[PDB]
Amino acid sequence: EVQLVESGGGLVQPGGSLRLSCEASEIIVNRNYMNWVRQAPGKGLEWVSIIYPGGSTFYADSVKGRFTISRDNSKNTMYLQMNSLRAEDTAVYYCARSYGDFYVDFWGQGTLVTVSS
Amino acid sequence: NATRFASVYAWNRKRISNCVADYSVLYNAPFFTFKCYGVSPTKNDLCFTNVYADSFVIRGDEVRQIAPGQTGNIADYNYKLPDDFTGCVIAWNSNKLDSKVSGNYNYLYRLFRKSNLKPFERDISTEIYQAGNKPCNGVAGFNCYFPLRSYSFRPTYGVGHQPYRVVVLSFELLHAPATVCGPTNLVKNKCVNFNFNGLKGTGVLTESNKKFLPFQQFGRDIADTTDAVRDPQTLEI
Amino acid sequence: STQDLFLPFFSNVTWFHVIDNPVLPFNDGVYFASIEKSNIIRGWIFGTTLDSKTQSLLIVNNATNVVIKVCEFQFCNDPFLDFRVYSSANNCTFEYVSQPFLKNLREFVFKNIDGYFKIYSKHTPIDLPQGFSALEPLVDLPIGINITRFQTLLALHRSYLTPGDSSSGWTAGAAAYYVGYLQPRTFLLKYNENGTITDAVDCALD
Amino acid sequence: EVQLVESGGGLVQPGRSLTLSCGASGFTFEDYAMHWVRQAPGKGLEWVSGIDWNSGVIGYADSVKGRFIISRDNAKNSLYLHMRSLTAEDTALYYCAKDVYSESGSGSYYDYWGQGTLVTVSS
Amino acid sequence: QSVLTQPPSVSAAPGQKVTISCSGSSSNIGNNYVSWYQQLPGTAPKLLIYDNNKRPSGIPDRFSGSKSGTSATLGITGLQTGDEADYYCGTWDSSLSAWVFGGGTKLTVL
Amino acid sequence: QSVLTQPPSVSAAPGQKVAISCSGSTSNIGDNFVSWYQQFPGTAPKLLLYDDARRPSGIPDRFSGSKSGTSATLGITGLQTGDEAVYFCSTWDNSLNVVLFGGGTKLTVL
Ligand SMILES: *[C@@H]1O[C@H](CO)[C@@H](O)[C@H](O)[C@H]1NC(C)=O
Ligand SMILES: *[C@@H]1O[C@H](CO)[C@@H](O)[C@H](O)[C@H]1NC(C)=O
Ligand SMILES: *[C@@H]1O[C@H](CO)[C@@H](O)[C@H](O)[C@H]1NC(C)=O
16 A cells, blocks of 8 residues: 655754654655645645655745755655754644646645744 | 757757857847856857757746756756756747647656756656556556656747747867867958967968968978968968 | 988888788888779778777778778678678777779878877879879878777679688789888978978988 | 668557667668658558657657657667557558658658568457 | 635535635746645645646546636535535746645535 | 548559549648659558659659649559559648548559
8 A cells, every 4th residue: 555654743942953754655755756745733735845856855935944855765765854943833744745746646644843842 | 940849858969060150140039048158158269179959849937947057857857967068058939830739749858767867868768667666567557657748838828838949059179170160350461469279479461372282281481480370260371 | 300200211111912911010100002903902900909809990992982980890800892791790989981092003101199090192193113202191080099900901803701712712903012111210301392292311221 | 772670560468558669771860851650451551650850750640649759869770659558450560661851741752661560459 | 926825715505516716826827737635624635636627546526627827726516515624726836946835725514 | 631532443454544533632732742652562662753743763654643733643554464553642731730641542454
């Protein structure tokens, strides 16, 4: 069966650092164009980052520079390095496979993230 | 001025050599883009041993991807420009010519691939891309994608989705006699600096009257004084 | 007064016949000649081994074109042209085509220096003649290869694609071609009014 | 002196793709705009695809639009036609025709024809 | 400034066709392809419509998608109770080089 | 979609003049050039004309002919028992932009 399962979500202090991870089964993360999208409670999916087959990355405006997406060599799993958080990064991050640039076919369940003391 | 242009995934490469390249005629449908990387576009008096013209049809928003050190759908998988490109990415709208409704499926681009393109690599192959554990078996299916996808141009779309024909000229310099010298006019009968392909000097150039045999490109008088010279561009003594 | 690879005046150059074309060494270039009424000496093959093991070269003056290739065919032990008798297979790197090179006396000088081949030539209308003639440059082939052994080709009638003609075969019209090896010397050339060499003085013969 | 070799001809099942890969010999390839013309047994010719010297396709027959992809390499002196999603009617013998022009569509005459290869699509 | 605009809510009774309109600047929706996603409560977005008209992998029928100029439209014949979710519209804004999503409609059955 | 219309079959005694009419419309024959092809059984078709009159070297002089209007015609004489074959009229289209071909007419020597 196809499935993407993500872990790494919990409370964290402002300015902290996390390694969220996206684990892929039935699919191969080192090939299909993979995407990290978010949705703060009561809000709208916002594109965070897309990883291309060839390694190229794209990030949104608000999430530029601080963050990083990466693709494991052999574990069949992808990871977001979230650094320099603020109040507007409270989220339920999802990892999703996106045929090309056209539509996002498969969505992971969801990994809460909180920025508070 | 060719009637039809190659798809972006099978770009051509018309090698050009042993001629005089007049770069002015290229200035002209409105050339919405004419950039150059490595050489100043404004006013052609250099000699290159080879000019490669790579010509294709890319949509408007992706003309910005034909540029050194740029990434995306076109530069990664279809046409990869190197990091030290020397040449001029010319482009122009072609919604009149290349945007029919009988020719929907004449223009395809490579949407999937396993690794970025090595600079100036063309892949025409159409192997079913495997994006899953199960084998594709040579037939497209779930997690088994056919790479090439069609532009399907229409005449009513925007100016950002309309076929911007593109030509990439690369000028190349080997340790071989350069022959693509495309016309600088230089004054005669008056003391003038002359720079013949690095042969630098100062003097009065006059219509020669000595018979150089076709294998001779210089002229020496007694005591090795340079008495006559031929132009490496227009071959004048 | 030029010092370069010249043929020492009054050397004794080897004589050959057609009425056997063995491989020869290529020391510092070669002065090659030919005397015949109808073209029998068509082309040459060059290289350090003249086989598929290493890179090699073929020059041939065909009926209407000269073809120059450097791509290391599996040359037959008795290369021959009637075509395709010489070469067997090859992946080619350089290629060149031009007009044909030529009771007549051909002449050539092959010298390979700094990764550049150089061919000179002088076709004349005619025991080498006692006269004198300077060899105008013909081509300068930029190709980075080693050349230590060369062998000529012929255009006789009866022969086998396999090396079956050993010490015997078709006896065609007499075609005598001469071969001398160039030494590094220093001549004092005499250019005349239009720049046509008319004499030369060997600076160590006498 | 102009021989046009074929390839890729053999029974293929009703849904699998195929690759017919014509060749060439004895003439300048990148000067001439090649073609691909099929003929069903017991019927006349049916144009299938064209191409030019710049590998800018001309267009496919109406029945085979969006399922045949024609390309070429002037270096390997070839002309490929990757059939996708075949059917029963696509069985035919495929000549790798030729055009004297390089523009293909001012009313051209196709000079040299390969001997062709037979593609049969049945269970 | 391109971010597609979508009505805050749309409501209809069962048996009445429901129409949702996603409008945006022609930089992203006039030159690229819309796609439409459905988010059931407490779950993850499920693709609903792709490539401006299609319906993938046997989605329940009567779901329709269309594109008119710089706008996109989703349609559901009748308003079934199970269809209650949030609906989003997404296009690849090349000017921002970013996926852009709509506001999201709270479909409520009357 | 206009289609070229050759006669399905033709029969004639040896020696007479044989007419093969390829009928079309303005877009196909009324505006461009038509060429004719000869096919023997189990052979690859070969050139027999071009430019509506001219002949490739070797082209039978006995088979020649040009016509105006929307139709083209081929004329044949000295029918040898070997001249039994199928003749195709080839044409380009200016509007639909796809090369058209004739159905094919078979010649019989009685
Ligand atoms: C020719 O083929 C040989 C043997 O496969 C290979 O070693 C060599 O690199 C090839 N050379 C060229 C010029 O392709
Ligand atoms: C010729 O031989 C020399 C000495 O071994 C070697 O260094 C050189 O590479 C050879 N030339 C070529 C073209 O390989
Ligand atoms: C040089 O050319 C001139 C003019 O053609 C001629 O009169 C003279 O004899 C030539 N000298 C030689 C023999 O080189």
